[PDB]
Every structure is written in structure tokens, then in C-alpha cells.
Amino acid sequence: ARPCDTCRSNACTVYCHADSAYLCMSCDAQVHSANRVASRHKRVRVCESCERAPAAFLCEADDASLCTACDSEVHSANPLARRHQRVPI
Ligand SMILES: [Zn+2]
Ligand SMILES: [Zn+2]
Ligand SMILES: [Zn+2]
Ligand SMILES: [Zn+2]
């Protein structure tokens, strides 16, 4: 999986595109609270499946946010899984 890029000790939970880095939540809240410009970064969640990527879709049934690839892969497996209605972040 992926370690947090500010502190390499935790695992990343979020992705900031502007900073182009994947963070854990304490780093996330630290880094973008520092100033009013970091404050206006917009940050999306890392995939809860692969953990190495940013999430394109949310699923309520899977209660998860996943990459395009992993979103497609989770709901590829079953007609059952395919029927899940996913929505973008
Ligand atoms: Zn961290
Ligand atoms: Zn940022
Ligand atoms: Zn994924
Ligand atoms: Zn689903």
C-alpha cells in the first residue's frame, strides 16, 4: 500500500492534486490549515480498496470510494456487484 507523503509513517487516506501528494488525515489537516491558500486546496479520498490511488466513485452499498479501475473491478465480478449504483466524488 502507500505511505503518507508528509509523514512517511502512516498510510494515506486522502489525495491532494495541487500538492500532488497522498496524505494521512493528520497531515492533511496540518498542511492545509497552515495558511489561507493551503486552506483552499480541494482534496479527494484515496481508494479504500487499492490504497494507492485517488477515488473516482462512491458506493453506498459497498460503503466505499474507489478508483475508476478498482471501481470497475469490484463490480465486474458479479451480476450482483454490477447492479450496485455508484456515483462520482
Ligand atoms: Zn501522515
Ligand atoms: Zn493541498
Ligand atoms: Zn482502487
Ligand atoms: Zn458497489
JSON list of C-alpha atoms and ligand atoms in Angstrom, two decimals:
[
{"chain": "A", "resi": 1, "resn": "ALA", "atom": "CA", "xyz": [0.00, 0.00, 0.00]},
{"chain": "A", "resi": 2, "resn": "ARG", "atom": "CA", "xyz": [1.02, 3.66, 0.23]},
{"chain": "A", "resi": 3, "resn": "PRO", "atom": "CA", "xyz": [2.63, 5.55, 3.00]},
{"chain": "A", "resi": 4, "resn": "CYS", "atom": "CA", "xyz": [1.69, 9.12, 3.81]},
{"chain": "A", "resi": 5, "resn": "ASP", "atom": "CA", "xyz": [3.95, 11.57, 1.94]},
{"chain": "A", "resi": 6, "resn": "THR", "atom": "CA", "xyz": [4.38, 14.25, 4.65]},
{"chain": "A", "resi": 7, "resn": "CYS", "atom": "CA", "xyz": [4.99, 11.76, 7.43]},
{"chain": "A", "resi": 8, "resn": "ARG", "atom": "CA", "xyz": [6.09, 8.51, 5.76]},
{"chain": "A", "resi": 9, "resn": "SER", "atom": "CA", "xyz": [4.92, 6.70, 8.92]},
{"chain": "A", "resi": 10, "resn": "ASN", "atom": "CA", "xyz": [1.15, 6.46, 8.36]},
{"chain": "A", "resi": 11, "resn": "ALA", "atom": "CA", "xyz": [-0.81, 5.36, 5.34]},
{"chain": "A", "resi": 12, "resn": "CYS", "atom": "CA", "xyz": [-2.51, 7.78, 3.05]},
{"chain": "A", "resi": 13, "resn": "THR", "atom": "CA", "xyz": [-6.22, 8.41, 3.35]},
{"chain": "A", "resi": 14, "resn": "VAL", "atom": "CA", "xyz": [-6.59, 11.44, 1.10]},
{"chain": "A", "resi": 15, "resn": "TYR", "atom": "CA", "xyz": [-5.12, 12.84, -2.12]},
{"chain": "A", "resi": 16, "resn": "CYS", "atom": "CA", "xyz": [-4.34, 16.48, -2.84]},
{"chain": "A", "resi": 17, "resn": "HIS", "atom": "CA", "xyz": [-3.84, 17.16, -6.55]},
{"chain": "A", "resi": 18, "resn": "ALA", "atom": "CA", "xyz": [-2.45, 20.67, -6.13]},
{"chain": "A", "resi": 19, "resn": "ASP", "atom": "CA", "xyz": [0.15, 19.39, -3.73]},
{"chain": "A", "resi": 20, "resn": "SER", "atom": "CA", "xyz": [0.19, 16.27, -5.93]},
{"chain": "A", "resi": 21, "resn": "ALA", "atom": "CA", "xyz": [0.68, 14.13, -2.84]},
{"chain": "A", "resi": 22, "resn": "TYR", "atom": "CA", "xyz": [-1.19, 11.44, -0.93]},
{"chain": "A", "resi": 23, "resn": "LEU", "atom": "CA", "xyz": [-1.64, 12.05, 2.80]},
{"chain": "A", "resi": 24, "resn": "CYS", "atom": "CA", "xyz": [-2.97, 10.61, 6.04]},
{"chain": "A", "resi": 25, "resn": "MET", "atom": "CA", "xyz": [-5.58, 12.70, 7.86]},
{"chain": "A", "resi": 26, "resn": "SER", "atom": "CA", "xyz": [-3.41, 14.41, 10.50]},
{"chain": "A", "resi": 27, "resn": "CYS", "atom": "CA", "xyz": [-1.00, 15.54, 7.84]},
{"chain": "A", "resi": 28, "resn": "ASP", "atom": "CA", "xyz": [-3.95, 16.55, 5.66]},
{"chain": "A", "resi": 29, "resn": "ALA", "atom": "CA", "xyz": [-5.38, 18.76, 8.40]},
{"chain": "A", "resi": 30, "resn": "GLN", "atom": "CA", "xyz": [-1.94, 20.11, 9.36]},
{"chain": "A", "resi": 31, "resn": "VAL", "atom": "CA", "xyz": [-0.70, 21.01, 5.90]},
{"chain": "A", "resi": 32, "resn": "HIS", "atom": "CA", "xyz": [-3.77, 22.81, 4.65]},
{"chain": "A", "resi": 33, "resn": "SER", "atom": "CA", "xyz": [-4.54, 24.66, 7.89]},
{"chain": "A", "resi": 34, "resn": "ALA", "atom": "CA", "xyz": [-1.16, 26.40, 7.82]},
{"chain": "A", "resi": 35, "resn": "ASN", "atom": "CA", "xyz": [-2.34, 29.22, 5.59]},
{"chain": "A", "resi": 36, "resn": "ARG", "atom": "CA", "xyz": [-5.40, 30.61, 3.76]},
{"chain": "A", "resi": 37, "resn": "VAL", "atom": "CA", "xyz": [-4.12, 29.34, 0.41]},
{"chain": "A", "resi": 38, "resn": "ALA", "atom": "CA", "xyz": [-3.48, 25.78, 1.54]},
{"chain": "A", "resi": 39, "resn": "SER", "atom": "CA", "xyz": [-6.96, 26.04, 3.06]},
{"chain": "A", "resi": 40, "resn": "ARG", "atom": "CA", "xyz": [-8.46, 26.36, -0.39]},
{"chain": "A", "resi": 41, "resn": "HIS", "atom": "CA", "xyz": [-6.91, 23.21, -1.73]},
{"chain": "A", "resi": 42, "resn": "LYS", "atom": "CA", "xyz": [-9.53, 20.67, -2.62]},
{"chain": "A", "resi": 43, "resn": "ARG", "atom": "CA", "xyz": [-8.81, 17.14, -1.57]},
{"chain": "A", "resi": 44, "resn": "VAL", "atom": "CA", "xyz": [-10.39, 13.84, -2.53]},
{"chain": "A", "resi": 45, "resn": "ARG", "atom": "CA", "xyz": [-10.12, 10.45, -0.77]},
{"chain": "A", "resi": 46, "resn": "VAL", "atom": "CA", "xyz": [-7.66, 7.68, -1.56]},
{"chain": "A", "resi": 47, "resn": "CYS", "atom": "CA", "xyz": [-9.22, 4.45, -2.79]},
{"chain": "A", "resi": 48, "resn": "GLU", "atom": "CA", "xyz": [-10.35, 2.26, 0.07]},
{"chain": "A", "resi": 49, "resn": "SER", "atom": "CA", "xyz": [-9.54, -0.81, -1.94]},
{"chain": "A", "resi": 50, "resn": "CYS", "atom": "CA", "xyz": [-6.18, -0.40, -3.65]},
{"chain": "A", "resi": 51, "resn": "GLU", "atom": "CA", "xyz": [-4.96, 2.28, -1.30]},
{"chain": "A", "resi": 52, "resn": "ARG", "atom": "CA", "xyz": [-2.52, 3.51, -3.91]},
{"chain": "A", "resi": 53, "resn": "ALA", "atom": "CA", "xyz": [-4.71, 5.89, -5.83]},
{"chain": "A", "resi": 54, "resn": "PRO", "atom": "CA", "xyz": [-7.37, 8.57, -5.81]},
{"chain": "A", "resi": 55, "resn": "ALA", "atom": "CA", "xyz": [-11.09, 7.73, -5.84]},
{"chain": "A", "resi": 56, "resn": "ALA", "atom": "CA", "xyz": [-13.35, 8.45, -8.80]},
{"chain": "A", "resi": 57, "resn": "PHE", "atom": "CA", "xyz": [-16.53, 6.82, -7.42]},
{"chain": "A", "resi": 58, "resn": "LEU", "atom": "CA", "xyz": [-18.52, 6.38, -4.18]},
{"chain": "A", "resi": 59, "resn": "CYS", "atom": "CA", "xyz": [-20.75, 3.38, -3.47]},
{"chain": "A", "resi": 60, "resn": "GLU", "atom": "CA", "xyz": [-23.37, 3.39, -0.72]},
{"chain": "A", "resi": 61, "resn": "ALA", "atom": "CA", "xyz": [-23.88, -0.35, -0.86]},
{"chain": "A", "resi": 62, "resn": "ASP", "atom": "CA", "xyz": [-20.14, -1.06, -0.74]},
{"chain": "A", "resi": 63, "resn": "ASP", "atom": "CA", "xyz": [-19.75, 1.97, 1.56]},
{"chain": "A", "resi": 64, "resn": "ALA", "atom": "CA", "xyz": [-16.54, 2.71, -0.33]},
{"chain": "A", "resi": 65, "resn": "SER", "atom": "CA", "xyz": [-14.70, 5.22, -2.54]},
{"chain": "A", "resi": 66, "resn": "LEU", "atom": "CA", "xyz": [-12.67, 3.66, -5.39]},
{"chain": "A", "resi": 67, "resn": "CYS", "atom": "CA", "xyz": [-10.52, 4.43, -8.45]},
{"chain": "A", "resi": 68, "resn": "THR", "atom": "CA", "xyz": [-12.01, 4.08, -11.92]},
{"chain": "A", "resi": 69, "resn": "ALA", "atom": "CA", "xyz": [-10.10, 0.82, -12.37]},
{"chain": "A", "resi": 70, "resn": "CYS", "atom": "CA", "xyz": [-10.90, -0.60, -8.96]},
{"chain": "A", "resi": 71, "resn": "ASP", "atom": "CA", "xyz": [-14.46, 0.73, -9.11]},
{"chain": "A", "resi": 72, "resn": "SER", "atom": "CA", "xyz": [-14.94, -1.17, -12.35]},
{"chain": "A", "resi": 73, "resn": "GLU", "atom": "CA", "xyz": [-13.17, -4.25, -10.97]},
{"chain": "A", "resi": 74, "resn": "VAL", "atom": "CA", "xyz": [-15.24, -4.58, -7.82]},
{"chain": "A", "resi": 75, "resn": "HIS", "atom": "CA", "xyz": [-18.49, -4.50, -9.76]},
{"chain": "A", "resi": 76, "resn": "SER", "atom": "CA", "xyz": [-17.18, -6.59, -12.67]},
{"chain": "A", "resi": 77, "resn": "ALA", "atom": "CA", "xyz": [-17.10, -9.79, -10.59]},
{"chain": "A", "resi": 78, "resn": "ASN", "atom": "CA", "xyz": [-20.83, -10.36, -10.12]},
{"chain": "A", "resi": 79, "resn": "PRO", "atom": "CA", "xyz": [-24.13, -9.55, -11.82]},
{"chain": "A", "resi": 80, "resn": "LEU", "atom": "CA", "xyz": [-24.92, -8.81, -8.22]},
{"chain": "A", "resi": 81, "resn": "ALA", "atom": "CA", "xyz": [-21.97, -6.46, -7.84]},
{"chain": "A", "resi": 82, "resn": "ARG", "atom": "CA", "xyz": [-22.62, -4.90, -11.24]},
{"chain": "A", "resi": 83, "resn": "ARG", "atom": "CA", "xyz": [-26.09, -3.81, -10.12]},
{"chain": "A", "resi": 84, "resn": "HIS", "atom": "CA", "xyz": [-24.57, -1.52, -7.45]},
{"chain": "A", "resi": 85, "resn": "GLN", "atom": "CA", "xyz": [-25.22, 2.13, -8.22]},
{"chain": "A", "resi": 86, "resn": "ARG", "atom": "CA", "xyz": [-22.04, 4.15, -7.89]},
{"chain": "A", "resi": 87, "resn": "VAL", "atom": "CA", "xyz": [-21.71, 7.95, -8.01]},
{"chain": "A", "resi": 88, "resn": "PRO", "atom": "CA", "xyz": [-18.69, 10.25, -8.52]},
{"chain": "A", "resi": 89, "resn": "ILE", "atom": "CA", "xyz": [-16.85, 12.29, -5.81]},
{"chain": "B", "resi": 1, "resn": "ZN", "atom": "ZN", "xyz": [0.90, 11.28, 7.55]},
{"chain": "B", "resi": 2, "resn": "ZN", "atom": "ZN", "xyz": [-3.10, 20.65, -0.98]},
{"chain": "B", "resi": 3, "resn": "ZN", "atom": "ZN", "xyz": [-8.64, 1.45, -6.29]},
{"chain": "B", "resi": 4, "resn": "ZN", "atom": "ZN", "xyz": [-20.78, -1.04, -5.08]}
]
